[PDB]
PDB file of C-alpha atoms in Angstrom:
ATOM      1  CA  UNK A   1       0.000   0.000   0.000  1.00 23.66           C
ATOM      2  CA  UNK A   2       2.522   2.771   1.134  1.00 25.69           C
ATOM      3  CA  UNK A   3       4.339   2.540  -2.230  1.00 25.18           C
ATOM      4  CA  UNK A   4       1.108   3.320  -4.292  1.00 26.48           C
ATOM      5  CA  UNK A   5       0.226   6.021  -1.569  1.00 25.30           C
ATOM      6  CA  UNK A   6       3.710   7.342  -2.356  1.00 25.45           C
ATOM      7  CA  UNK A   7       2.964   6.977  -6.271  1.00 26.59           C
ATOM      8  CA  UNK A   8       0.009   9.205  -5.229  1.00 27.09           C
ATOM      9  CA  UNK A   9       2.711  11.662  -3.441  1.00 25.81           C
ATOM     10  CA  UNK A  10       5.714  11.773  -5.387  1.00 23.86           C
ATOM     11  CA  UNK A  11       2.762  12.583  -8.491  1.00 23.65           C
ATOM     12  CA  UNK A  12       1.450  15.685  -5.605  1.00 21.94           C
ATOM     13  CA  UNK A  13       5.091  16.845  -4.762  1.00 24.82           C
ATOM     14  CA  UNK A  14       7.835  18.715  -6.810  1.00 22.60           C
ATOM     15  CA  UNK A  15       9.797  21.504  -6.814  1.00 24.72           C
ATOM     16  CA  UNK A  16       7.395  24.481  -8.043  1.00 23.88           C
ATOM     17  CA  UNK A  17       4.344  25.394  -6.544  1.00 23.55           C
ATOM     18  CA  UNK A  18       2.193  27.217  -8.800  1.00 23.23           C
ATOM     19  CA  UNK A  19       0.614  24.631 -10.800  1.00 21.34           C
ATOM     20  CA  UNK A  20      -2.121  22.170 -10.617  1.00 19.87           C
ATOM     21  CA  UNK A  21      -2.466  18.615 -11.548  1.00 17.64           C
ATOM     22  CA  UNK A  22      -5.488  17.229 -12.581  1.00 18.24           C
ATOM     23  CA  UNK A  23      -4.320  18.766 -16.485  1.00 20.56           C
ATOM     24  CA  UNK A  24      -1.607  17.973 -18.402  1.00 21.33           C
ATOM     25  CA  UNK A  25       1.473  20.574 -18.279  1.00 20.11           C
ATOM     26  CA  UNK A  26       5.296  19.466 -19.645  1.00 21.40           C
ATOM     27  CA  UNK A  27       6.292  19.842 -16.005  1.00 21.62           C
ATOM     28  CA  UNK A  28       3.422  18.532 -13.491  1.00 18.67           C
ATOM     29  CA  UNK A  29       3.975  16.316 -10.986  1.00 21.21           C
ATOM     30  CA  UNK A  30       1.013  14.391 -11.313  1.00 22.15           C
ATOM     31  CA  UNK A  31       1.089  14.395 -15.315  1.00 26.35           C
ATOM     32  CA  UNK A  32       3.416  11.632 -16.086  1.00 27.41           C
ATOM     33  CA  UNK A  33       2.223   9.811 -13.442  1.00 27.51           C
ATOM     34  CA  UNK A  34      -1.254   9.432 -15.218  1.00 27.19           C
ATOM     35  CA  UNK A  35      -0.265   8.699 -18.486  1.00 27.68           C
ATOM     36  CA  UNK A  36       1.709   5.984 -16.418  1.00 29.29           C
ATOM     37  CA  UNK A  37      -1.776   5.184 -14.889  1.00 30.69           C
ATOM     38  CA  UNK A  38      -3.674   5.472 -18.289  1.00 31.50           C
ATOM     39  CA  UNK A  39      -1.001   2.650 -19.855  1.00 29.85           C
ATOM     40  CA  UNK A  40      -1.078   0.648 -16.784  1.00 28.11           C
ATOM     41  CA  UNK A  41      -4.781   0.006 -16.505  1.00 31.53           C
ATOM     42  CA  UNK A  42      -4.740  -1.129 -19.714  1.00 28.60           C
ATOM     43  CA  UNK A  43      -3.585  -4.010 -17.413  1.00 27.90           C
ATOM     44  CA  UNK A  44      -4.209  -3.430 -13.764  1.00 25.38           C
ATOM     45  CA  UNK A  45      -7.352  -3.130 -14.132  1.00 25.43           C
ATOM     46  CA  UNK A  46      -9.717  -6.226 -12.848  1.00 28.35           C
ATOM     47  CA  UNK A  47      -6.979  -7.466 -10.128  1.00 26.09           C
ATOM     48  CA  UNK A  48      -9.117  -5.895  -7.394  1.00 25.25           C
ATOM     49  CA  UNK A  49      -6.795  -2.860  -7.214  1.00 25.91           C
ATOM     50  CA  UNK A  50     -10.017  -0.670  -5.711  1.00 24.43           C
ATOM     51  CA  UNK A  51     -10.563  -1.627  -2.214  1.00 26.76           C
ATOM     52  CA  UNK A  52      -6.653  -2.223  -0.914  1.00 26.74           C
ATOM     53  CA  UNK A  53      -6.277   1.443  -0.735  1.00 29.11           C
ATOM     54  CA  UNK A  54     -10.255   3.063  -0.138  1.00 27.48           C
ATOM     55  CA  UNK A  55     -10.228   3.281   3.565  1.00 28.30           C
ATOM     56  CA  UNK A  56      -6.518   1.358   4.052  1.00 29.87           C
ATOM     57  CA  UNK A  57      -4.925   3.118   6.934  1.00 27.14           C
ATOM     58  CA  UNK A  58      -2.696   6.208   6.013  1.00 26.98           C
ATOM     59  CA  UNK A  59      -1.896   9.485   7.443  1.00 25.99           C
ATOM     60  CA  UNK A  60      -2.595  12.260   5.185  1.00 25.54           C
ATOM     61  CA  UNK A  61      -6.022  13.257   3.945  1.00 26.12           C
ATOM     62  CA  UNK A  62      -4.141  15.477   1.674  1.00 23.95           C
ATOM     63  CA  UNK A  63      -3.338  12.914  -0.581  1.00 20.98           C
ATOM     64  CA  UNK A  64      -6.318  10.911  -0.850  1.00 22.19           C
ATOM     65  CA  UNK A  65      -8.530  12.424  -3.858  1.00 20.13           C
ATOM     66  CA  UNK A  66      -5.688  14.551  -4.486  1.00 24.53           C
ATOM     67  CA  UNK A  67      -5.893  12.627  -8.212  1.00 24.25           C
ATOM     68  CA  UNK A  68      -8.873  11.222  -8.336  1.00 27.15           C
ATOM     69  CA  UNK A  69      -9.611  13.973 -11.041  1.00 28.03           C
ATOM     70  CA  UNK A  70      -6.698  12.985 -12.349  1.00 30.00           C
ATOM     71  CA  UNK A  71      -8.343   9.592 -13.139  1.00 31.98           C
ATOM     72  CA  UNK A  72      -9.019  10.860 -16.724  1.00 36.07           C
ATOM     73  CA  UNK A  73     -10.095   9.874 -20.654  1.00 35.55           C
ATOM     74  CA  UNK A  74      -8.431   5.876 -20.777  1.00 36.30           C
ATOM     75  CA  UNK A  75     -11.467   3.825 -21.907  1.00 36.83           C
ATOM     76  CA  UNK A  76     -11.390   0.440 -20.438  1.00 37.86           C
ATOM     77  CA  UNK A  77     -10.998   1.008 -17.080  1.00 37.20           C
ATOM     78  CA  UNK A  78     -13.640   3.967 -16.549  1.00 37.94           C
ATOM     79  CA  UNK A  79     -14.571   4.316 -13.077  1.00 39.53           C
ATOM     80  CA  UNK A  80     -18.482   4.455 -14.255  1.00 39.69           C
ATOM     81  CA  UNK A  81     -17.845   1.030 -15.304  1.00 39.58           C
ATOM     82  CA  UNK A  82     -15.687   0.287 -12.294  1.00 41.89           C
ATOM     83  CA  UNK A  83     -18.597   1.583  -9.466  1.00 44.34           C
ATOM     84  CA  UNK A  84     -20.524  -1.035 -10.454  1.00 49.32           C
ATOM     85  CA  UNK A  85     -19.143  -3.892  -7.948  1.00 49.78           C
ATOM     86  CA  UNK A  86     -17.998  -1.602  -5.124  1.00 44.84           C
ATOM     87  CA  UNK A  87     -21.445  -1.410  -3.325  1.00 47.33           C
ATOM     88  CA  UNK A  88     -22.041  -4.442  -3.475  1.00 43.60           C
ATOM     89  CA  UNK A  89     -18.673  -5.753  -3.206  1.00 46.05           C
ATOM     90  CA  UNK A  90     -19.042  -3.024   0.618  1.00 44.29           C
ATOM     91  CA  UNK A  91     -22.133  -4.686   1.530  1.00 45.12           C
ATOM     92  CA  UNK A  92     -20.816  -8.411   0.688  1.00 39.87           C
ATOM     93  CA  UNK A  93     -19.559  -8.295   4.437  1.00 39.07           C
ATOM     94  CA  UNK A  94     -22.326  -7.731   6.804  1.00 37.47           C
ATOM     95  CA  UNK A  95     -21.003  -5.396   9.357  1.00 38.41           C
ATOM     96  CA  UNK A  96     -18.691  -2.849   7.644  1.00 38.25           C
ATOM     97  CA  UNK A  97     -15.172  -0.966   9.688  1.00 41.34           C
ATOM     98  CA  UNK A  98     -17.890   0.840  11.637  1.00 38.82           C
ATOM     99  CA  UNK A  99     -18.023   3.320  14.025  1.00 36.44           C
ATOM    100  CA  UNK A 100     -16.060   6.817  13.480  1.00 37.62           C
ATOM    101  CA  UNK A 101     -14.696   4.389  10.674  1.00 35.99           C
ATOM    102  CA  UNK A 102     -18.332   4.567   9.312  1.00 35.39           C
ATOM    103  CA  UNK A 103     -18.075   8.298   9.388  1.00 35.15           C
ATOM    104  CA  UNK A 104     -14.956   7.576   7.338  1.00 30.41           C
ATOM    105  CA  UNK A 105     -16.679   5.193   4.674  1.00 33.31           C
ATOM    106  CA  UNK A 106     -19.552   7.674   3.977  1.00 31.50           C
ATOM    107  CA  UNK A 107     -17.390  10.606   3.626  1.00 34.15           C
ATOM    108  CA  UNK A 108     -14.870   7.721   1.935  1.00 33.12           C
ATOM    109  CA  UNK A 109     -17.506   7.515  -1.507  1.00 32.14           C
ATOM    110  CA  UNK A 110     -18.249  11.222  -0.564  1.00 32.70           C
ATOM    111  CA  UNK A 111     -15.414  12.430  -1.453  1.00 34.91           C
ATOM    112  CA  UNK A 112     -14.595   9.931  -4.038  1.00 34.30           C
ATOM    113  CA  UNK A 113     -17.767  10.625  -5.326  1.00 34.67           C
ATOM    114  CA  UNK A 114     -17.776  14.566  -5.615  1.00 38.06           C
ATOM    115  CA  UNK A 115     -14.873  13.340  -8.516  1.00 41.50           C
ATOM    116  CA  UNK A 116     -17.617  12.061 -10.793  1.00 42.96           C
ATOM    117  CA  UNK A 117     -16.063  13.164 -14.341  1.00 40.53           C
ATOM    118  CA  UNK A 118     -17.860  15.732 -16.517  1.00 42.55           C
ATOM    119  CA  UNK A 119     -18.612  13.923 -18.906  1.00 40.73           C
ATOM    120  CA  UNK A 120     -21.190  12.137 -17.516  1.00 39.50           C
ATOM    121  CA  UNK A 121     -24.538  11.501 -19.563  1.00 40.71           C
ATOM    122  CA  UNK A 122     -28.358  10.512 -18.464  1.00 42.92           C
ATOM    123  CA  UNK A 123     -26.923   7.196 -19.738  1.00 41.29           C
ATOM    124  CA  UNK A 124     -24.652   4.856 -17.419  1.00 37.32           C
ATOM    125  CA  UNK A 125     -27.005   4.273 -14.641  1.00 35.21           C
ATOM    126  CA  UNK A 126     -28.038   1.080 -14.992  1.00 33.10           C
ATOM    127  CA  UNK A 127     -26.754  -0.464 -11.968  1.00 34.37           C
ATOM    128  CA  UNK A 128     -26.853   2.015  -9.574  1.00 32.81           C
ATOM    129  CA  UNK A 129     -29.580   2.843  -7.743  1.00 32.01           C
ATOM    130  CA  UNK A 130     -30.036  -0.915  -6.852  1.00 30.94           C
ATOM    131  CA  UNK A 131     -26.686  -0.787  -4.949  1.00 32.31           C
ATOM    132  CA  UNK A 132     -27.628   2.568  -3.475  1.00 32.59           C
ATOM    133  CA  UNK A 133     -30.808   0.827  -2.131  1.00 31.67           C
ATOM    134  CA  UNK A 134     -29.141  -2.058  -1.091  1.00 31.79           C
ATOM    135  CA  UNK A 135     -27.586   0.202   1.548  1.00 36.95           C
ATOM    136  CA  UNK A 136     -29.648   2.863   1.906  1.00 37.01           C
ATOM    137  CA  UNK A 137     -32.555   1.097   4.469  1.00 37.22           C
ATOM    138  CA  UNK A 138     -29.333   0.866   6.319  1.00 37.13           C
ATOM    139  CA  UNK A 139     -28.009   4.166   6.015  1.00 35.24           C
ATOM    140  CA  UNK A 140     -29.868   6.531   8.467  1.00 33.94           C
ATOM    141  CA  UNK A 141     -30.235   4.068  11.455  1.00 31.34           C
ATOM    142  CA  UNK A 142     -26.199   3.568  12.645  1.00 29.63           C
ATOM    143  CA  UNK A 143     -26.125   7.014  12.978  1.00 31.90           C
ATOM    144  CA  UNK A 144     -26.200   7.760  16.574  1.00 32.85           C
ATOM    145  CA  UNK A 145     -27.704  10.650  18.191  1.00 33.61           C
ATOM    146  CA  UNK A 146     -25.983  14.259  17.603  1.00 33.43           C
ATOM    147  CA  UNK A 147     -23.409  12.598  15.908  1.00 34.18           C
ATOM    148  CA  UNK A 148     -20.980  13.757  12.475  1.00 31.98           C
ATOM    149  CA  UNK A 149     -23.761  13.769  10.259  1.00 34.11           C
ATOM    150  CA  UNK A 150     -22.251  15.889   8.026  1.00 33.58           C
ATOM    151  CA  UNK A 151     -21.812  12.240   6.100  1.00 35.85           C
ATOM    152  CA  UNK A 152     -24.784  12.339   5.670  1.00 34.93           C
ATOM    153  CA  UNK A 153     -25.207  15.642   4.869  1.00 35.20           C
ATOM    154  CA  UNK A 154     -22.716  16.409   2.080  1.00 31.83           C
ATOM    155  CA  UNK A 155     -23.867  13.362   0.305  1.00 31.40           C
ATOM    156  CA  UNK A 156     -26.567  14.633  -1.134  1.00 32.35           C
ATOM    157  CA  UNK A 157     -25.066  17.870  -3.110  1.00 31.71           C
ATOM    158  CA  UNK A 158     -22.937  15.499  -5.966  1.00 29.92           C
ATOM    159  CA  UNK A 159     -25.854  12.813  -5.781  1.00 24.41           C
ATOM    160  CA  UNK A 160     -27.397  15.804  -7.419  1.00 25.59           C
ATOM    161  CA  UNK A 161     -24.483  16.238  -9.617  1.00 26.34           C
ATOM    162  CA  UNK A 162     -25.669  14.088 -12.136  1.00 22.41           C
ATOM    163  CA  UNK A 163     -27.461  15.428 -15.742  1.00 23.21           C
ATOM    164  CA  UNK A 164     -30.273  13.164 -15.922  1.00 23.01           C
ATOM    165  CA  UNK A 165     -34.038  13.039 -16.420  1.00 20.37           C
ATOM    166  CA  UNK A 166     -35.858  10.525 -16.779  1.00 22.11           C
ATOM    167  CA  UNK A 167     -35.539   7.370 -14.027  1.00 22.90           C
ATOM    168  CA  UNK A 168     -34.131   9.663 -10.881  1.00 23.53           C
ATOM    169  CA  UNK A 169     -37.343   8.615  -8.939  1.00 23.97           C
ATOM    170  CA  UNK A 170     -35.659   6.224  -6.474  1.00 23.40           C
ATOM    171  CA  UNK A 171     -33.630   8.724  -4.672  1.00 25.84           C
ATOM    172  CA  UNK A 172     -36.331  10.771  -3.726  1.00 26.35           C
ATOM    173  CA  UNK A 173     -37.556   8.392  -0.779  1.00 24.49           C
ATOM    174  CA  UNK A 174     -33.879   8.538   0.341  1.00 23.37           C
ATOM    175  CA  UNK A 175     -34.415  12.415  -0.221  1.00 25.31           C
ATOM    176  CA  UNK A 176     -37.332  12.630   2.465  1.00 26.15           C
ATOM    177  CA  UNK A 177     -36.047   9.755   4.166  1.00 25.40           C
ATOM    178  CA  UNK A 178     -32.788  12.179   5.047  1.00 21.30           C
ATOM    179  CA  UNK A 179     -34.465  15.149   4.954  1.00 20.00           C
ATOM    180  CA  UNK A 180     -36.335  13.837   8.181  1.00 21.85           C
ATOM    181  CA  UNK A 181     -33.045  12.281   9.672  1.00 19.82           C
ATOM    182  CA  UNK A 182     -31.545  15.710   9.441  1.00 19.22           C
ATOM    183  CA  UNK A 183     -34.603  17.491  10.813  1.00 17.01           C
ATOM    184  CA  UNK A 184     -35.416  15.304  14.444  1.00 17.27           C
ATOM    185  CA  UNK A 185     -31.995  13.920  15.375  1.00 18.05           C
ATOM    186  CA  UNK A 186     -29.860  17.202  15.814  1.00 17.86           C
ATOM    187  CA  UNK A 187     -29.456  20.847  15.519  1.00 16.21           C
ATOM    188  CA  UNK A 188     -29.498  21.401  11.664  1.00 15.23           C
ATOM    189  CA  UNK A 189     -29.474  24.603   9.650  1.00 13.79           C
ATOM    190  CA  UNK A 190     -30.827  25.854   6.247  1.00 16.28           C
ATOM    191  CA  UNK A 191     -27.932  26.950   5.187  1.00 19.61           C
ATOM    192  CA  UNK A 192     -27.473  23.819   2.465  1.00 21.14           C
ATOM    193  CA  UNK A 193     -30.810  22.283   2.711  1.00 18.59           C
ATOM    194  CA  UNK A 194     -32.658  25.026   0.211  1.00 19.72           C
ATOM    195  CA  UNK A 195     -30.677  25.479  -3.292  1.00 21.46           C
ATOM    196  CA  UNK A 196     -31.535  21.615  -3.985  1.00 22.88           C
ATOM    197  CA  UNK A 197     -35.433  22.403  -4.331  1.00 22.44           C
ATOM    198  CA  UNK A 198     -34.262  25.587  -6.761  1.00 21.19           C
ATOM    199  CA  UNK A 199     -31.982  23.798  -8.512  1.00 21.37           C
ATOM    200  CA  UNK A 200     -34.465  21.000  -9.225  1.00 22.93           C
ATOM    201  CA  UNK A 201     -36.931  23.621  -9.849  1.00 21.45           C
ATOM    202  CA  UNK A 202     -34.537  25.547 -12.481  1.00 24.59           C
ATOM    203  CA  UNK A 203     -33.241  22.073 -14.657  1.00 27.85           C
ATOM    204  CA  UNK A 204     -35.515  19.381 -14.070  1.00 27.01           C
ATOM    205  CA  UNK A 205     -39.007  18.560 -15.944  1.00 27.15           C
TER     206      UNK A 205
END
């Protein structure tokens, strides 16, 4: 694990400073480290490589997601293609690393999942909401009382994220489900909990 954490690294670390890498620049750390990871997946792909290094134990939150943007155009291993088995690959164990650890798996495809590419039709989703579902009667209850439900919170914003319009209906009884979770257990706000209505009312049919 710590050398592809320090593939990660080494592809977040140079020299200069005033750069970014999720685009290609003759001179970016993370650059030539993804067309590395565009020819290797080519290969690497269907060895399991996804869940040694998800919620593995490391010590920089930094670096995860730091190139998960970086994931970009290679064709056979797409990550659209690739979230197919991970849900229900999560769920194939009944009791996940739970606890704060929970905290860390929700915020885990959180933040993995705020990197959904932008090219992303009304097209791939398939197999989705099934392995959403699958977890989702089990989503609100482990959270305890006045917890970090901010996991629960931020989800929501890139499940929105998505340009689609015709078969989003499942979603929605998660969408009341957590917008009465968020309304009886703790002290919540308005401060994120009123642009979704808008926005569905600006886009949607």
């Amino acid at each position: 694990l710590d050398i592809m954490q320090s593939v990660g690294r080494l592809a977040s670390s140079t020299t200069f400073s005033n750069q970014a890498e999720s685009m290609m620049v003759p001179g970016n750390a993370a650059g030539v480290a993804k067309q590395f990871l565009r020819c290797i997946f080519h290969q690497l792909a269907p060895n399991g490589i996804f869940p040694q290094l998800f919620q593995s134990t490391i010590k920089d939150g930094t670096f995860l997601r730091t190139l998960a943007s970086s994931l970009m155009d290679f064709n056979e291993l797409s990550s659209i293609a690739a979230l197919s088995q991970l849900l229900e690959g999560l769920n194939n164990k009944k009791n996940l690393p739970a606890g704060g650890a929970m905290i860390r798996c929700l915020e885990n495809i959180a933040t993995f999942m705020e990197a959904l590419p932008m090219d992303s039709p009304s097209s791939l989703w398939t197999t989705i909401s099934n392995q959403f579902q699958t977890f989702f009667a089990k989503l609100p209850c482990v959270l305890p009382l006045k917890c970090s439900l901010d996991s629960s919170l931020r989800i929501m914003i890139c499940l929105l994220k998505i340009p689609s319009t015709n078969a989003t209906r499942s979603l929605l009884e998660p969408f009341s489900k957590l917008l009465s979770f968020v309304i009886q257990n703790a002290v919540f706000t308005l401060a994120y909990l009123v642009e979704l209505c808008g926005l569905c009312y600006r886009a949607f049919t």
